[PDB]
Structure formats: structure tokens, C-alpha cells
Design a protein around this nucleic acid. Structure first.
Lengths: 1340, 23, 98
RNA sequence: UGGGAGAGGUA
């Protein structure tokens, strides 16, 4: 155990050992953007792949061409924090050497005429942060990965969508990456068809004739021949015995002297066996057998040259007579059946109205571009550019793989375009599906759906911008001359920036990141969406794709999804899931070999795991060898059954393999019903971080993994000792073995303090290490918002009781004690930003100033001399933070004085109060002000003071980090010189400037001293360079929006306590609203006088079946009992030996638990620190589907001297009497969700109204009224409340001359209205009149 | 061929195709 | 059969009494009281809590050959939970659609 | 002024 893990060891109850640890949780986004942005020699990904897909490009003449050489990315102009402050995107400039060579077409090949190349700036691409996010326009975004269908060919049939016959219609679909589609399909008349881009149908031989295949070659490709042999007016036929399958023999087959079948006798397999053991080949057939067949060969006459019979036509008596007199004594008809070799292609050729390649191309043109006269070159060019052109069609190397795998081919590579053999194989395979061999494809398989991620989507949008810029530069180099043109002036840098900024700003998958807690960030980054560009559509999707497929096991979580209309469409990645090189999801598995479950870990896709047989995770082992039973439970082909121990092929790598992260943080998940487990996994992301975070007593073990992998903590990069801990800076002196020989060995960890998140919560990092403590590589130094000692901590441990309390927990409601409120347990900080921007009106500019017309001195009591509020001012609702007055002339006038400005005169003076006020009911201090003035004007005194504060702060920060690095470098200098020579006192009495020039002759330590002296020189050089860069960066102005003079950004900080109305929740879907905050003398209490903190209703348990709530309550009671015993020993100050014995006795309690915490290897101060962290309860890891049982829970409760049934006697706090039945009391982890009644409470009497409708606005932000909808109108109509309904429709709404009358009538004490016509009805009359329709009211 | 079209630029390009280019 | 055994054992195990003899009466188990009063619960949910979870269905409307032989007190394994998620997500989509 | 889209969430 490490020296930071000995501080608080979570007692794991897990039984199965962790063979493979949980991987990096954010590997998907970071790996996708790294593949997009890195440089690759031949395996082209991203920018190099697009820059080779679009370059080089010549003219129409070939006089010149532009070549791509190499690309690089410059340093971003602003950092992450500076982009988040200034409100700009975090991007790096793209520079690429574009080589322009000039040919000489006047010469035969004048290749070298003029060669130009320079680093052309082609837009900026937004960089990804170290946590997986994109800072776009000052807001942090997350690009959600997409689940779309893979490119390739998919065979599927409708399930009888024509009940006139009940037939099923098999069909194919060749989906490319980019390019048109292709849909071969059947009809109820068994005639194949073709839909290109889902347009009107054409017969499916039009494509074959367009592929230069005549009717002869079509019939050879799609049929085999029953060859006939007519000699001297008796017909014989060359018979292979594998052609007579289950039909009544209308004719009798013969031999040389043998008779086999009789009249009216169906052919049997026994007779087929008879024929293949007698082995006759040539059988005389009667005349009537050929009458009914279809000839597969056109038969020209050799004498007259007249075509006596073509191919694909029905024969007859006169036709066979014509063949016999013409002399073709070997006629060839195709083999057909009625159950296994259908006459499909013959009927399609009969219904086909074209007979030539050119007429087929004309028909394809008339289907594609209707209402246009076709020609030869346009029809041929359109059909070639449909599928057989590299720049208008692409399967993109994953469609080729799925194409060859669906057609059972071998080579997984090839071209991206379609071909003759490809289309022929698709039609052949669809015919095979129709005949019976093979089955349709499962469209909800995860071998058919792939993961398209942020790097692939950014490569696609970069390619769109690239082909736009390519077209523009191609017409430029085709039109202009060649002597004065450069690549810099001929490449436009607008459309690539437009494409990538349109994507990264307002795509459907570029989402405003949820950062309530670290769990919300990690779940938003690990999200998979079925919607998006080229995916599904939300209202147009049904239960077929919103289901849990059996291939989702280990790849997609079944119990983390929203419960609204996005339920089967937004998904979450499983814990161990990865992607292929193609983008298909795969999950690890342990390989068994002769029963021995090895550590061979194989990542199998969904198509490979159906072939094998994979054992369950909950099957026991011995010595990591065989299975202890002989019939283990497995799953093959999607179904589950029992299998033998030598039959098994694979085994699951863990027990948390199926669930996602948030569904793995639920303890006792296997006792919760999946509905409430889904709701609890969703509600875990809505938890607000509190004032002091608290580790859960009943956890899982994924807490540390989430808290480190979320990137919200501050982990150590290298191991060493800690040199200085502030509340904003941790300095670590690195150990020598982890130190590079050229650096100073000093790590600086600046912490973020009170930064507003996306959901207006608090983000601040607090140091968890102390002064002088050692840390290792990967150690948590600073906690996050809702972390605690590197463990995820979303709520607080509340002593809970399950009983009804006077109806105060009636229907999911929660009764809360007063200690919860006094102890600030659910007190959350909500930082909130309000901006006041002084615009540029055309009547003059709006002035930010100290003087405000028509306010008292109770408004300017907190302002400064410049009009801005002071940093630290305890403002309340309605106070003025920054005063802004409009110029001479108002902007919108109130009707109380609008008539007084009309009849007396608008003064063209007396400016309007337009100040930034705190919203109503919102207290809080002011923690930061930021003024962004436009570049060019003199700013202000307060803005100048803020700028001097930033200047001296940046100088102090850079000089302090320079002094710290100088102290580290000088300590390394004195260490290496003490190791070299014996110079101790002569360097202490010498000043530190004379530490780099003295020494002795040249050795390894002298070279180290010289290179560290050069390190110090370049350190102070980069120090003064960065100081001057920061100085010019903070003195230069901010290029704001056009029309903006200056913006003042005020930052409030509200501290929110719980109150009745706040939604609280546990991890099992046990949500509800606080109904009352009870006094602690009124709360129920036990025999020791400890009152409970929260009273929950037990009626919410049985119909919802979330028993993990009750088991978490019991295990939390046992954990707090153990912590109470440790606290009693620490308050009695007993020993260290009895404490070591009791903590070891509590750690060794499980039945067959994996971890062995031995305290004999511990020191005494380590055991004392462990007990000081254990005195508030022993944290317990309960893995999902690997948890503690009732026997372990009851043994722990018997250790803690607690009742083993988990139910104690409670007394009423009011009457003093005892409750009759024993009540379940324990400790449950309760979260404060982000649905706060301060944010939901909103009332309005009269405010502002919409422009067109003259109805009130909508929202708490703009002070709007509640909608009285159609359903509420129906409710009032069903009551009969006609006057109430009429006053909802007119005087509380769009009756402009009636609502002012109603307001003055109410002020005059007269509760009577005078309603009139709704202005929205006048709007509707005007719109129907504008539609050319005379509607009018009729005066009787 | 006239008939099954509604795109007016397509109708313009169809009806302008009657005339021939000049030498 | 296991549901009938569960209902009998939950319904009448309170027998240890006096003053006429040891005699059977209606049980004061709180789960049974919440079920029998009609407060919150029913015998199907009590069967899922204490007896057997029952036969679940595939998403194509077909009942599986083996049922979930565990309950929520003992907990389900990973296969039984993944089997139950089909009907769970099907019902949760049907509520929105209806 | 206060509109329209897109995304997410609650009952």
C-alpha cells in the first residue's frame, strides 16, 4: 500500500479478483482527436488523409498544379484560461507548405518553369483540452460520439407489409460512406427492382444492361442450363441427377433398358439415390416437357439469317418444329424450379422495357434527372459518376470490409467504388436469400453499427472545407496568369474556418458540457448518440431501435439512458468497452484453455463473440484454474444456456463489464429494479457539489477511478516530497530517480479557485496533502469540486429512518432535521456571472457612470467612483452592480408617462435608468469584476485599477515561480557539487550567484553543472520573455463585437442552504422533495438520544422494488457503528495496540474477500492517521453484482455491537413515547439535485408583452406568465367557469385596452372587467387576409 | 421531354436546349 | 407454486401466541400489511420481492426458456439483470409513447 | 427589443 493509500483504506467486500483494471475512462475522445491531429506516414488519418484526398490538383489544361508537402500547427495565441475569460475559441493556427509547380504546355514537357512554396495559413482548428473538452467561444463543449450504420451492404426483408398475399419482400441496400445509394428489392410478383437514392423503381436488369451485359450474359450469370439434345424427331436431354427435387413426374424418366418413375409419382430422394448409383446421363423426353420452358440462347438461322427464336422466350410446338427444320439439334434452355431456383430474372427481363445499353442509360437518366432531354455523353457520364468514380462515391475502407464480409469474400481491402462483380454478387446473394440459403441481416446488431467520433467528424468537415477551397483555387489557377500568383494569395482562408467553426459551434453533436459534478463530465464525454447528422431522427423512430440488443453486453449500458423521448437513442459506453480500427465496439474477455482461465485478454467485437461460447462472470474458480463445477452458465448466439467446463471458449473479464460508470457507482445495484436503477444512475449526474465533500460509507471502488480519470482533481505527475502548500499552489520537489538530468526537479501545481462552471455551480480545488509529506507518481494532491481524498463524493451520509411521520413524508416527500441545516451539510455555492455591455446606439453612446437619475443614496452605497461595484460587496436583490445610462433619448417608455410625454412633450433629455441589477430574491457577495474595453479608447479609472492589479499579480506570480525554480536549481547545483568535491562551508558563505562559475576540472558533474547553468540562463531568459508577452497581452485591447464600447462582467456568489421545495435523492432512484425542516427536539431519537437526520417513507420501497436502498441503509449503519467504536477508542485515548487489533479485526471480516489489509506492516503514526480518518465511519466498497451479502452485513453489525436486524427502538421526540414497531435506522448517501426551488419559484402580476401577439412573455429570466393552454381551457369549459375563462383569454392576456382598464379597476377597488377583441385574433385576421382570402367580422 | 419536372432552372435549361450554338 | 408458498409463509407465520393456545392469526409483517391494506403494493410485487422474479420476455414478444429464479432480496446475477433490462426499457418507452 | 432554431433536462 502506498503512503497516500494508507490514509483511508476502503474495506472491499468483493470476491472475484481484478484481473484487468478499469482503463482510462476518457480514452475515446482523446484517442480520436489524437488520430485526427497527429502526423502519420502511410496509415493516413485526419489532416494528412484529407490533404492527400484533395491534393494535388491540376487545371483543365494542365499548365500548373498545386502540391501538398507538409502541415504543422502553431502555438495558440491564448491559453485555456485566457480563452475562457475573454470569450474566444481555443484553437491553433494551421500552416502548410503548399508547393506550386508550373509546367510549360508550349513545351512538350516543360516541368520546371517556376516553383513556389510557402506556409499557407488555411484556417484555425480548435484544439482539445487535456480532459477531452473543446473551449468554443469561452464555453466548454463536448463532441458526443455517434452510432450510425456501417457502410456496406445489408439484406433485410419487411415482415409482410402487403396483407393481400402475406408474402415477405427481401431487399438489399448498398450504403456507402459518401455517394448515392442502391436498393435491390422484390415485389409481390417476384420481379426484382432497383432504387437509386430511394427514387422511382426500375426493373433490376436496367443496371445490368447499363453495365454492358446483354441478355445472353445476364441469363448465363443468373441461371444454369438444362441442355437438350433432339435427334431424328425424338427428344433427349442431358440429365445430372441433382436437378429433380420434390416434384410430380408428369413425364417418366427412362434409361437404356431401365424404368424408374411412374405416372403421377413424385420424385423422391430414394429415386435420386437410385439414379446416381445406376449412373445414366442421357434420357429421352417427350414433346410436352419442353413446352413450358424458357430458352436461354438466341438461335440465328444459318441459311436465311433470320432470328427464328431469341433468348428469354416461351417455346411452343411450332417453335420446336421450326428449330428442328432449321437444324439446331442441340437447343439450350435454362434450369428453373418453383421452390429453390425461381424464375425471377426471366420475369424481370420480360417486364423490362429496354433492350440495349444506351436505352438503359437513357432510362437511368430519366429516372435520375426527370424532365430533361438525355444524350449519350451526359447519360454515360452520369451513370459513371454515380458509383464508378473516385471523387463522387466512397465505401472508405470499412464499407469495403463489411462488403467483402457480407458477400463471404476473403480480401478485406480493395477500392471504394462499386464494380460489375460487386453488383452481380449483391444480386446473386439477394436471390440466395429469396431462395432460402442465408438469412437477413440484423440491423440492430453492434457489428453493423460503428462509432463515429470527434476526430472522424472533424476530418469530414475539414474535407468539406477542403473541397470548397479546392474548387475556388482550381478555377483561380485555370483563369488567371502564372507569373504574379502565389499560393498565399490564391488560397482563401475563409471557408475552412467557416466549416470547422460551424461544426464545432453549432453541430447537433457539439454539446454544452454538463459539469455539475465530475460524474456528469465523464458521462457526457462517454456518451453515444444514435441521432445526429446522417443518423436517426428522434420523432421518427420506434421501439425496434430503442430496445436492448443482446450484443450490447459489455459495449453499451442497458441501465443508463434518459427516460424522455431520447430513451433508446442516447446511450452510454460500458466501462471496459473499446473500439476497433474501423469503429466497431469491442469488449475484453478472458481466454480459457483446457479449462484453465488464463490472463489472456482478448477484445472481441460483436460478430466474433457469437461464434465462441463465453462463460459468465459469476462462475467460481480455484487457484485461477478450472471451474469448480462441471456445468457452468454461458451465452452463445445471444441466448443463454448451460455448457460443460471443456466446451467453454471465453470468460468475462469483470463483473462491472455490462454497466456504465454511473450505473457502476450504485451499490447493491443487483437488488434494485432496473427502472429505479436507471433513474438513480441518471439522477447521480444532477448532484450539486456541497460545501464540504463527504466520502460515501457504502461505495463501490469506482469512486477513485472516476475522481482521477475525470481530470477534475490535481494528480501528481512525478513522485517526490512536498515543499510548499498554499490554498492555491502546491510545490513538489521531485525524487532524484524520477528526475530528468536537465531540469530543476520542481513541479508547480496551481489550483483553480472559485470558477463558475457551465451550470453556474462552484469549481474550486483544495489541497489534500500536508507540508513535508511524500507523494508518488499518480497521487492526488488537490481535491476537486465533489471529490474527497481522491474519492468521488457527490452527497452526504445522513442518518436515516424509514417510518411515516404524520404525513410529512406522504408521496415521496422527505422530512429533514435541523442539524442538516445548521451543519451546512447541503449548502452549495452557486457562482453566477452577469454582464453589462455599454452598446453604441445611434443617439449617442450609453455611458457607464457613477451618477444615476432618480435613485436614492441607498443604491450608490456600494458603487465605486466609476460606477462599478466593489470586490467583496454583500449585495442583495435589486442592488446596482454597474450603472449604465442610455444617451439623451430613451428606448421604451411606460404608458403611465407615455401620454405625459405625448401631450406635454418628449423632452429629448432626461435619460433612462438601464443599470445592471441583481435579480429579485438573489443575495450573494461579489467575488470578481472584469472590464473589457474596446481597443483604441482610454478605458476608465476602475478598469485601469483592475489592469494594474492584473499587472502586479502576473509579475508576482512569474517572479515567485522563478524564485522557486531558482531555489530548486541551486539546491541541485549544491547537491551535485557536494557529490563531486568536498565544498560545504565555502559555498554557504558564498552567495548563490557565485554557485555556477566555481568548481574543479571537467567531469560528469562538471558537465551537469554547466548544463544546469545554461538551464538557469534560458530559464531567466524565458522568464523575462514571458513577462513581456504577458504584459503586452494584458495591456492590449479586446476586439469585441461591432457596436460594443465596453463590457463589465460581475461575478456573484450565492450560498444556498436547503429548504422545503428542494429535490433530494439517493443512488437507487429514491428521489423526492424536502417537505419540512423539523426541529431536533421533534425528530425521532434512539435510546442514546441521537436523533435521526432524515425520515423517509417505507411505502416507497415495496412497489418500486429498490431493495439496495435498504441494504445500503443496513451496511451504512454497520459502517458508522465501526467508526463509532474507533471514535470511542480515540476519545478514551486508549493505546495503539488495541486500535490496531480492532481495525485489523474489522478489516478481516469477509467470507472470501480478495483484499488482505495487514496492519503489521503499518507504523504507529500510520495507524493513528488511519484511525483519525476512520473515526467518522469505515468506508466500504460494495462492487456491482459482487457485493456484500446479508450474512456479511449482519456479521459486521454484530462486530459493531449493533442489532443484527438493522432495526432499533425509536422514541417520539414530541410525546416522548416509544414507537410500537422497530424502525429501520441507518446511514444512506443522499444527494442534493440541481432542481432548486429558488430557481423554480416564479410569479408575475404584470410585465412585458410580445410584439406581434401582445401576450405576456415566457420565463423566469424575462418575467413571464404561465401558459393557460388548450387543456386548461378544456378544464374551465368542463366546469362551466365562463367568466374565469373569458378573463384568462382577454384581460390577463392580449386585450391591450382591456388589461389596463382591469388594472386600474383593481386599484380602484372595482373587481369588474370590460373585455374586448384579442389582438392575437386581429393578427390572425390580418394573416388570413394577407393569404388572399377575404375573412371579415360581420356586424350582424 | 416535357412533363414530370418542377425545378424552374431545369425547365429553363431544357427549353434553352432547343437553340444551337453559333460559329 | 413458489408464489403460493411465499404468500402463505408471509401471510400466516405469526402463530406464537397465548391465552387460548398457540394459534394462527394474520401476520404483522410490514410488507404484508402494506400489501393487504391496499396502501402501496400488490401480490405480484411481493412475489418479485420475496418469491421468484418470474418468466421474462425477449423484445420480440417471446418468453425465454429459463426464468429469473432469483429475487431482489437475494439479488440477481449479471445475466438475469441484463434479461430484465429488455422489459424494463420496453415499458419505459411504452409509457412515453402512450 | 425580444423572435426563431438546435441541444439537454424535469413531472
Amino acid at each position: 500500500y502506498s503512503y497516500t493509500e494508507k490514509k483511508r483504506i476502503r474495506k472491499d467486500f468483493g470476491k472475484r479478483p481484478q484481473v484487468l483494471d478499469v482503463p482510462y475512462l476518457l480514452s475515446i475522445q482523446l484517442d480520436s482527436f489524437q488520430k485526427f491531429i497527429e502526423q502519420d506516414p502511410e496509415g493516413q488519418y485526419g489532416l494528412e488523409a484529407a490533404f492527400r484526398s484533395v491534393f494535388p490538383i491540376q487545371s483543365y489544361s494542365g499548365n500548373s498544379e498545386l502540391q501538398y508537402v507538409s502541415y504543422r500547427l502553431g502555438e495558440p495565441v491564448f491559453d485555456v484560461q485566457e480563452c475562457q475569460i475573454r470569450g474566444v475559441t481555443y484553437s491553433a493556427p494551421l500552416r502548410v507548405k503548399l508547393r506550386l509547380v508550373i509546367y510549360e504546355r508550349e513545351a512538350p514537357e516543360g516541368t520546371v518553369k517556376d516553383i513556389k512554396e510557402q506556409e499557407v495559413y488555411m484556417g484555425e482548428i480548435p484544439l482539445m483540452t487535456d480532459n477531452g473538452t473543446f473551449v468554443i467561444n469561452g464555453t466548454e463543449r463536448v463532441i458526443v460520439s455517434q452510432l450510425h450504420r456501417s457502410p456496406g451492404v445489408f439484406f433485410d426483408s419487411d415482415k409482410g407489409k402487403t396483407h393481400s398475399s402475406g408474402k415477405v419482400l427481401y431487399n438489399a441496400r448498398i450504403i456507402p460512406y459518401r455517394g448515392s445509394w442502391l436498393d435491390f428489392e422484390f415485389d409481390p410478383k417476384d420481379n426484382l427492382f432497383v432504387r437509386i437514392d430511394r427514387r422511382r423503381k426500375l426493373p433490376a436488369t436496367i443496371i445490368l444492361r447499363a453495365l454492358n451485359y446483354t441478355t445472353e450474359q445476364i441469363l448465363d450469370l443468373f441461371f444454369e442450363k438444362v441442355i437438350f439434345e433432339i435427334r431424328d424427331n425424338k427428344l433427349q436431354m442431358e440429365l445430372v441427377p441433382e436437378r429433380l427435387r420434390g416434384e410430380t413426374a408428369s413425364f417418366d424418366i427412362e434409361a437404356n433398358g431401365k424404368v424408374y418413375v411412374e405416372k403421377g409419382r413424385r420424385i423422391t430422394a430414394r429415386h435420386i439415390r437410385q439414379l446416381e448409383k445406376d449412373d445414366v446421363k442421357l434420357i429421352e423426353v417427350p414433346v410436352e416437357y419442353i413446352a413450358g420452358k424458357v430458352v436461354a440462347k438466341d438461335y440465328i438461322d444459318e441459311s436465311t439469317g433470320e432470328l427464328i427464336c431469341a433468348a428469354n422466350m416461351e417455346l411452343s410446338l411450332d417453335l420446336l418444329a421450326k428449330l428442328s427444320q432449321s437444324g439446331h439439334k442441340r437447343i439450350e434452355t435454362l434450369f428453373t424450379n418453383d421452390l429453390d431456383h425461381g424464375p425471377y430474372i426471366s420475369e424481370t427481363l420480360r417486364v423490362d422495357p429496354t433492350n440495349d445499353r444506351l436505352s438503359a442509360l437513357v432510362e437511368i437518366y430519366r429516372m435520375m434527372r426527370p424532365g430533361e432531354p438525355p444524350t449519350r455523353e451526359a447519360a454515360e457520364s452520369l451513370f459513371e459518376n454515380l458509383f464508378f468514380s473516385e471523387d463522387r462515391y466512397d465505401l472508405s475502407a470499412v464499407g469495403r470490409m463489411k462488403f467483402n464480409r457480407s458477400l463471404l469474400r476473403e480480401e478485406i481491402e480493395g477500392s471504394g467504388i462499386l464494380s460489375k462483380d460487386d453488383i452481380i454478387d449483391v444480386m446473386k446473394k439477394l436471390i440466395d436469400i429469396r431462395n432460402g440459403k442465408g438469412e437477413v441481416d440484423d440491423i440492430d446488431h453492434l457489428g453493423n453499427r460503428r462509432i463515429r467520433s470527434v476526430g472522424e467528424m472533424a476530418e469530414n468537415q475539414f474535407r468539406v472545407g477542403l473541397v470548397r477551397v479546392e474548387r475556388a483555387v482550381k478555377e483561380r489557377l485555370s483563369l488567371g496568369d502564372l507569373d504574379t500568383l502565389m499560393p498565399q494569395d490564391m488560397i482563401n482562408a475563409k471557408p475552412i474556418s467557416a466549416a470547422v467553426k460551424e461544426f464545432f459551434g453549432s453541430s447537433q453533436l457539439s454539446q454544452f458540457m454538463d459539469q455539475n459534478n465530475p460524474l456528469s463530465e465523464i458521462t457526457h464525454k462517454r456518451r453515444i448518440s444514435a441521432l445526429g447528422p446522417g443518423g436517426l431522427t428522434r420523432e421518427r423512430a420506434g421501439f425496434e431501435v430503442r430496445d436492448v440488443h443482446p450484443t450490447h453486453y459489455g459495449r453499451v449500458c442497458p441501465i443508463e439512458t434518459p427516460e424522455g423521448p431520447n430513451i433508446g437513442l442516447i446511450n452510454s459506453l460500458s466501462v471496459y468497452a473499446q473500439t476497433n480500427e474501423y469503429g466497431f465496439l469491442e469488449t475484453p474477455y478472458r481466454k480459457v484453455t483446457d479449462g484453465v482461465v488464463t490472463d489472456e485478454i482478448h477484445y472481441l467485437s460483436a460478430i466474433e463473440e457469437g461464434n465462441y461460447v463465453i462463460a459468465q462472470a459469476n462462475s467460481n474458480l480455484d487457484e485461477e484454474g478450472h471451474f469448480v463445477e462441471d456445468l457452468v452458465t454461458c451465452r452463445s448466439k445471444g441466448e443463454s444456456s448451460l455448457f460443460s467446463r471443456d466446451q467453454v471458449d471465453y470468460m468475462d473479464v469483470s463483473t462491472q463489464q455490462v454497466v456504465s460508470v454511473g450505473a457502476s457507482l450504485i451499490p447493491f445495484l443487483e437488488h434494485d429494479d432496473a427502472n429505479r436503477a436507471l433513474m438513480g444512475a441518471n439522477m447521480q449526474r444532477q448532484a450539486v457539489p456541497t460545501l464540504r465533500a463527504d466520502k460515501p460509507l457504502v461505495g463501490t471502488g469506482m469512486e477513485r477511478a472516476v475522481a482521477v480519470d475525470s481530470g477534475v482533481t490535481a494528480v501528481a505527475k512525478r513522485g517526490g516530497v512536498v515543499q510548499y502548500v498554499d490554498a492555491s499552489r502546491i510545490v513538489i520537489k521531485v525524487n532524484e530517480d524520477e528526475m530528468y538530468p536537465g531540469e530543476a526537479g520542481i513541479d508547480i501545481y496551481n489550483l483553480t479557485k472559485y470558477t463558475r462552471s457551465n451550470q453556474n455551480t462552484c469549481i474550486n480545488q483544495m489541497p489534500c496533502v500536508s507540508l513535508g509529506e511524500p507523494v508518488e507518481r499518480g497521487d492526488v494532491l488537490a481535491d476537486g469540486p465533489s471529490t474527497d481524498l481522491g474519492e468521488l463524493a457527490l452527497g452526504q451520509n445522513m442518518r436515516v429512518a424509514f417510518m411515516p411521520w404524520n404525513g410529512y413524508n406522504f408521496e415521496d416527500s422527505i422530512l429533514v432535521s435541523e442539524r442538516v441545516v445548521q451543519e451546512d451539510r447541503f449548502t452549495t455555492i452557486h457562482i453566477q456571472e452577469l454582464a453589462c455591455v455599454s452598446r453604441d446606439t445611434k443617439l449617442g453612446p450609453e455611458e457607464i457612470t457613477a451618477d444615476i437619475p432618480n435613485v436614492g443614496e441607498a443604491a450608490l452605497s456600494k458603487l465605486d467612483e466609476s460606477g462599478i461595484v466593489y470586490i467583496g460587496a454583500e449585495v442583495t436583490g435589486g442592488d446596482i452592480l454597474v450603472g449604465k445610462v442610455t444617451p439623451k433619448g430613451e428606448t421604451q417608455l411606460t404608458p403611465e408617462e407615455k401620454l405625459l410625454r405625448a401631450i406635454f412633450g418628449e423632452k429629448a433629455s432626461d435619460v433612462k435608468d438601464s443599470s445592471l441589477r441583481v435579480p429579485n430574491g438573489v443575495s450573494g457577495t461579489v467575488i470578481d469584476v472584469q472590464v473589457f474595453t474596446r481597443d483604441g479608447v482610454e478605458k476608465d479609472k476602475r478598469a485601469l485599477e483592475i489592469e494594474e492589479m492584473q499587472l502586479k499579480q502576473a509579475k508576482k506570480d512569474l517572479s515567485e515561480e522563478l524564485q522557486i525554480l531558482e531555489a530548486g536549481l541551486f539546491s541541485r547545483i549544491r547537491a551535485v557539487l557536494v557529490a563531486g568535491g568536498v565544498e560545504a562551508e565555502k559555498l554557504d558563505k558564498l552567495p548563490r550567484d557565485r554557485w555556477l562559475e566555481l568548481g574543479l576540472t571537467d567531469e560528469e558533474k562538471q558537465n551537469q553543472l554547466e548544463q544546469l547553468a545554461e538551464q538557469y540562463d534560458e530559464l531567466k531568459h524565458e522568464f523575462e520573455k514571458k513577462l513581456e508577452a504577458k504584459r503586452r497581452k494584458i495591456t492590449q485591447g479586446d476586439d469585441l463585437a461591432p457596436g460594443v464600447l465596453k463590457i463589465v462582467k460581475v461575478y456573484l456568489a450565492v450560498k444556498r442552504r436547503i429548504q422545503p421545495g428542494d429535490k433530494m435523492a439517493g443512488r437507487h432512484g429514491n428521489k423526492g422533495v424536502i417537505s419540512k425542516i423539523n426541529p431536533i427536539e421533534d425528530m425521532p431519537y434512539d435510546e442514546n438520544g441521537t436523533p435521526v437526520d432524515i425520515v423517509l417513507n417505507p411505502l416507497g420501497v415495496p412497489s418500486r422494488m429498490n431493495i439496495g436502498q435498504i441494504l445500503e441503509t443496513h451496511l451504512g449503519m454497520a459502517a458508522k457503528g465501526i467508526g463509532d467504536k474507533i471514535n470511542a477508542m480515540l476519545k478514551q485515548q486508549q493505546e495503539v495496540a488495541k486500535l490496531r487489533e480492532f481495525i485489523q479485526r474489522a478489516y478481516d471480516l469477509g467470507a472470501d474477500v480478495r483484499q488482505k489489509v495487514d496492519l503489521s506492516t503499518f507504523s504507529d503514526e500510520e495507524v493513528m492517521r488511519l484511525a483519525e480518518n476512520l473515526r467518522k465511519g469505515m468506508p466500504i466498497a460494495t462492487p456491482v453484482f459482487d457485493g456484500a451479502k446479508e450474512a456479511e452485513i449482519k456479521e459486521l453489525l454484530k462486530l459493531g455491537d449493533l442489532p443484527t436486524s438493522g432495526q432499533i427502538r425509536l422514541y417520539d421526540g414530541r410525546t416522548g413515547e416509544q414507537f410500537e414497531r422497530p424502525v429501520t435506522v441507518g446511514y444512506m448517501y443522499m444527494l442534493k439535485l440541481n432542481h432548486l426551488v429558488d430557481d423554480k419559484m416564479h410569479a408575475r402580476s404584470t410585465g412585458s408583452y410580445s410584439l406581434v401577439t401582445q401576450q405576456p412573455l415566457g420565463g423566469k429570466a424575462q418575467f413571464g406568465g404561465q401558459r393557460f393552454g388548450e387543456m386548461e381551457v378544456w378544464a374551465l369549459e368542463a366546469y362551466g367557469a365562463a367568466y374565469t375563462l373569458q378573463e384568462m383569454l382577454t384581460v390577463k392576456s392580449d386585450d391591450v385596452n382591456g388589461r389596463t382598464k382591469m388594472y386600474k379597476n383593481i386599484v380602484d377597488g372595482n373587481h369588474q372587467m370590460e373585455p374586448g377583441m384579442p389582438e392575437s385574433f386581429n393578427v390572425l385576421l390580418k394573416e388570413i387576409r394577407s393569404l388572399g382570402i377575404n375573412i371579415e367580422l360581420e356586424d350582424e | 421531354e416535357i412533363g414530370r419536372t418542377t425545378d424552374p432552372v431545369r425547365m429553363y435549361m431544357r427549353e434553352m436546349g432547343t437553340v444551337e450554338l453559333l460559329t | 407454486r413458489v408464489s403460493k408458498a411465499m404468500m402463505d409463509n408471509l401471510q400466516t407465520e405469526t402463530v406464537i401466541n397465548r391465552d387460548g393456545q398457540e394459534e394462527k392469526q394474520v401476520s404483522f409483517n410490514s410488507i404484508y400489511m402494506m400489501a393487504d391494506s391496499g396502501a402501496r403494493g400488490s401480490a405480484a410485487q411481493i412475489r418479485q420481492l420475496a418469491g421468484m422474479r418470474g418468466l421474462m420476455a425477449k423484445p420480440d414478444g417471446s418468453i425465454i426458456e429459463t426464468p429469473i429464479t432469483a429475487n431482489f432480496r437475494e439479488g440477481l446475477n449479471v445475466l438475469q439483470y441484463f434479461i430484465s433490462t429488455h422489459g424494463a426499457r420496453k415499458g419505459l418507452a411504452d409509457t412515453a409513447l402512450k
